[PDB]
Amino acid sequence: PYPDPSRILGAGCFVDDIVKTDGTLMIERFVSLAIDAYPLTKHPNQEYADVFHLYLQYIRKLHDELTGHMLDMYSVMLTNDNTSRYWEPEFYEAMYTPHT
Amino acid sequence: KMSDVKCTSVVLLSVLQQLRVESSSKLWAQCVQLHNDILLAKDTTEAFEKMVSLLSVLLSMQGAVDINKLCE
Amino acid sequence: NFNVLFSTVFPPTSFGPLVRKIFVDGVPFVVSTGYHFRELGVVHNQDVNLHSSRLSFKELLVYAADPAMHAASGNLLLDKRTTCFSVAALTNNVAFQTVKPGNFNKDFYDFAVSKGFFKEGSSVELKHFFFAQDGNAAISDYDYYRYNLPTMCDIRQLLFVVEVVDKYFDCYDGGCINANQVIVNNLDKSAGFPFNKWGKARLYYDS
Amino acid sequence: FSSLPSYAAFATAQEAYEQAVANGDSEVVLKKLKKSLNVAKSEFDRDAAMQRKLEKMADQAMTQMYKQARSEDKRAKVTSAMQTMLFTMLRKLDNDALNNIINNARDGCVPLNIIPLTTAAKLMVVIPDYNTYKNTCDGTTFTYASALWEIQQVVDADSKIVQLSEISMDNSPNLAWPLIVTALRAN
Amino acid sequence: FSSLPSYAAFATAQEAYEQAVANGDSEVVLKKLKKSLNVAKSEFDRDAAMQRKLEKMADQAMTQMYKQARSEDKRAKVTSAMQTMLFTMLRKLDNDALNNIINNARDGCVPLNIIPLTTAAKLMVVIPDYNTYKNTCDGTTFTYASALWEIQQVVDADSKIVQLSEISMDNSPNLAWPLIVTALRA
RNA sequence: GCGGUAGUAGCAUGCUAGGGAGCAG
RNA sequence: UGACUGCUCCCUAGCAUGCUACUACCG
Numbered sequence: 026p027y028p029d030p031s032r033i034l035g036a037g038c039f040v041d042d043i044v045k046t047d048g049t050l051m052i053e054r055f056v057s058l059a060i061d062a063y064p065l066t067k068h069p070n071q072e073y074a075d076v077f078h079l080y081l082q083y084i085r086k087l088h089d090e091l092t093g094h095m096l097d098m099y100s101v102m103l104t105n106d107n108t109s110r111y112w113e114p115e116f117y118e119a120m121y122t123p124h125t
Numbered sequence: 126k127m128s129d130v131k132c133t134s135v136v137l138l139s140v141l142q143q144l145r146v147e148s149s150s151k152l153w154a155q156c157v158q159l160h161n162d163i164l165l166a167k168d169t170t171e172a173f174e175k176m177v178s179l180l181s182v183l184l185s186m187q188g189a190v191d192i193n194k195l196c197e
Numbered sequence: 198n199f200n201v202l203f204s205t206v207f208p209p210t211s212f213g214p215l216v217r218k219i220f221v222d223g224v225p226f227v228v229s230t231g232y233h234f235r236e237l238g239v240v241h242n243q244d245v246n247l248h249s250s251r252l253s254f255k256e257l258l259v260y261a262a263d264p265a266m267h268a269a270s271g272n273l274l275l276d277k278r279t280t281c282f283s284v285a286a287l288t289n290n291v292a293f294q295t296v297k298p299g300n301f302n303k304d305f306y307d308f309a310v311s312k313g314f315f316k317e318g319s320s321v322e323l324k325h326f327f328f329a330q331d332g333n334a335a336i337s338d339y340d341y342y343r344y345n346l347p348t349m350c351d352i353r354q355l356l357f358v359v360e361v362v363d364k365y366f367d368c369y370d371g372g373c374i375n376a377n378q379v380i381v382n383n384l385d386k387s388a389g390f391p392f393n394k395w396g397k398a399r400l401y402y403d404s
Numbered sequence: 405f406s407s408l409p410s411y412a413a414f415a416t417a418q419e420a421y422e423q424a425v426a427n428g429d430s431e432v433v434l435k436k437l438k439k440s441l442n443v444a445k446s447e448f449d450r451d452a453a454m455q456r457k458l459e460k461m462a463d464q465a466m467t468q469m470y471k472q473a474r475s476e477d478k479r480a481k482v483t484s485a486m487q488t489m490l491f492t493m494l495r496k497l498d499n500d501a502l503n504n505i506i507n508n509a510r511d512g513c514v515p516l517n518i519i520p521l522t523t524a525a526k527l528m529v530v531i532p533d534y535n536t537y538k539n540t541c542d543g544t545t546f547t548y549a550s551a552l553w554e555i556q557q558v559v560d561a562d563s564k565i566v567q568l569s570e571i572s573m574d575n576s577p578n579l580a581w582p583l584i585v586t587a588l589r590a591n
Numbered sequence: 592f593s594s595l596p597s598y599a600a601f602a603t604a605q606e607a608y609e610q611a612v613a614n615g616d617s618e619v620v621l622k623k624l625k626k627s628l629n630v631a632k633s634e635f636d637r638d639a640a641m642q643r644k645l646e647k648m649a650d651q652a653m654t655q656m657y658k659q660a661r662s663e664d665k666r667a668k669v670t671s672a673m674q675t676m677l678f679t680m681l682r683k684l685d686n687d688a689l690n691n692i693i694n695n696a697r698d699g700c701v702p703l704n705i706i707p708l709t710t711a712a713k714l715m716v717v718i719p720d721y722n723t724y725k726n727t728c729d730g731t732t733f734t735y736a737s738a739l740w741e742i743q744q745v746v747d748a749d750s751k752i753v754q755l756s757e758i759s760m761d762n763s764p765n766l767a768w769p770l771i772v773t774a775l776r777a
Numbered sequence: 778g779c780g781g782u783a784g785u786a787g788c789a790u791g792c793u794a795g796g797g798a799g800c801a802g
Numbered sequence: 803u804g805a806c807u808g809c810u811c812c813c814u815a816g817c818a819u820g821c822u823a824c825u826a827c828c829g
């Protein structure tokens with residue numbers, strides 16, 4: 026069951042509060058929004074599917090920028106990952122095949 | 126060009142509302158009126174006229190000190 | 198059903214609670230002691246105590262969650278904005294409440310156009326926005342009740358449609374439970390009028 | 405965790421084991437050192453292994469009763485506040501005209517939506533626009549609920565004051581418009 | 592990670608038992624060289640995972656504190672974030688209409704009421720000096736917001752409505768400048 | 778010899794509670 | 803000023819179960 030591309034995009038761009046804005050603090054929204062914007066990938070029309078891929082690349086950018094960013098002012102940062110599951114579709118796919 | 130216009134109107138109305146332009150009643154009523162007339166506009170010239178009108182609401186004061194703010 | 202009809206004819210300043218001045222610790226209040234609905238006729242309380250030296254906690258509660266004291270102590274009100282039968286007023290200045298606009302999240306926007314979205318002509322296009330509202334929106338929205346009229350419903354077929362609906366709801370089961378088996382998620386959501394000056398549902402679910 | 409009872413048995417037995425390693429005698433010395441050690445450790449098997457769950461249980465229950473004392477003070481605070489609100493909001497009940505309109509009813513029961521409408525001592529009427537303003541609160545007096553009211557002040561949206569001179573047709577569209585008239589009950 | 596004493600002890604145990612399994616000897620040495628190793632390997636590979644948990648916990652708690660510091664700033668500088676975001680968006684947006692009124696308001700010609708849009712209702716303006724005036728001002732028209740306002744009044748500070756024709760560059764150095772050169776839509 | 782049970786880590790599963798966020802009517 | 807209800811992800815805590823090895827002690 027897919028939603029409404031404009032809906033997902035809109036909810037991406039317009040937030041309430043200036044803390045929703047900054048993304049790095051809230052990488053936890055884009056994960057859910059991508060969980061809801063997945064079945065668009067199988068769709069026939071094009072720009073739909075590009076919504077999903079936009080969301081994935083956006084999570085990737087958010088992370089791999091936050092990590093180095095916090096590495097500098099630190100003097101270390103992320104060393105143990107498997108966050109790499111957040112930006113590939115084989116995570117988001119589990120939630121639409123019957124087993125759990 | 127369109128969607129740029131809608132989004133700049135949104136940030137516009139917010140920056141007004143931080144200056145207490147919500148405490149002059151009919152002022153805030155005209156503002157809210159414009160800023161929902163844009164967001165629904167299907168052409169893209171109505172948007173620009175309502176926009177310049179809305180902006181006039183902002184310039185007419187002394188807070189949004191333009192000269193410096195447009196430092197380029 | 199019948200009362201719903203025979204109760205248009207009578208006046209509408211005689212529905213609502215009843216009251217009666219009771220004396221607690223030799224002090225008089227007003228307290229509800231019944232109701233008068235447009236349908237279920239009159240309905241009298243059953244545990245009214247014409248006196249009391251001390252009210253407990255359950256009492257204090259069911260006396261501060263009542264209209265009678267607040268209304269019966271407030272300035273009259275005539276509201277020419279609506280048609281709904283106003284009643285009383287509490288403050289001295291009415292309050293006009295508004296709604297702000299959204300917030301833009303720019304970086305997602307530039308990143309969204311880079312990939313080539315929002316090309317004038319596309320099939321995805323911004324549409325869901327955070328709309329604003331001015332001052333008197335609250336009440337010009339409350340007003341919409343004036344689409345609600347007294348209605349008589351046919352009856353010799355309501356008394357059959359109610360069988361069949363009940364038949365649908367038949368595989369289930371239910372009953373009264375006790376005050377130690379209820380389940381309440383999210384325990385910091387507001388408690389409604391007279392109480393939300395003191396704390397969220399938590400505090401009245403403890404004490 | 406460093407001062408338990410059987411700790412002493414352990415201390416002596418294994419200090420003795422090390423004294424035996426200091427002499428270094430038979431293999432039955434090993435039999436000793438290896439039945440003593442294991443039995444003395446079979447002690448702490450229980451001492452610093454049970455009392456450490458006892459401290460869990462202790463401090464846990466203590467913190468629960470702390471939380472309970474907190475809740476029980478909150479109950480008192482809320483009661484005091486509710487009570488003083490009632491006993492300050494009653495005093496304005498206007499205990500006269502009320503006293504009449506009750507003591508005449510069939511028995512105390514008098515629908516609520518008339519107590520203010522016949523005993524309240526101040527009106528407050530809200531007007532949307534001028535054309536409706538005329539057909540009610542015009543002038544300095546009007547009548548509504550058939551008591552005689554007399555205007556005495558007018559505000560508006562922004563909560564300020566206007567003089568009743570200004571509400572014409574021409575000076576109308578400069579008035580934050582939902583004027584809020586605040587009358588009094590005149591006899 | 593080899594900076595813990597437990598690692599030293601396990602190192603010597605591994606070492607000696609390796610030496611003995613290499614050189615070869617009786618069973619007693621290597622049973623002693625198993626109850627002299629496996630205990631060391633224990634007292635090692637317990638703390639050397641406890642500590643790998645600790646340090647990770649540390650990193651996460653420090654990142655959480657970072658999130659909180661970043662927030663409790665970002666929700667305390669809206670008053671300028673909003674504004675600068677706005678003017679960059681305008682410059683990007685670009686329009687003779689906009690750009691025109693914006694330049695002007697950088698100078699003096701700052702309205703007193705909403706720029707109407709009907710072909711009837713009026714507007715006001717607050718010219719200062721003769722120049723900006725003369726650039727915009729001409730005869731009976733006042734071009735502005737890419738529109739042609741035709742004058743219907745002209746005034747001064749304490750409102751002694753002068754004419755227009757008086758005003759040049761030399762005679763005009765004699766008038767309360769801050770006009771309010773009213774007008775109507777073309 | 779084989780099992781006994783007891784303490785110690787390690788992993789998984791599940792349940793609990795508290796925290797953050799998203800969607801639907 | 804912040805309603806009721808349902809589904810879902812993420813991070814801690816605790817319990818249980820198992821899985822787990824190393825030590826034990828007894829037969």
Ligand SMILES: [Zn+2]
Pocket residue numbers: 372373
């Ligand atoms: Zn029941």
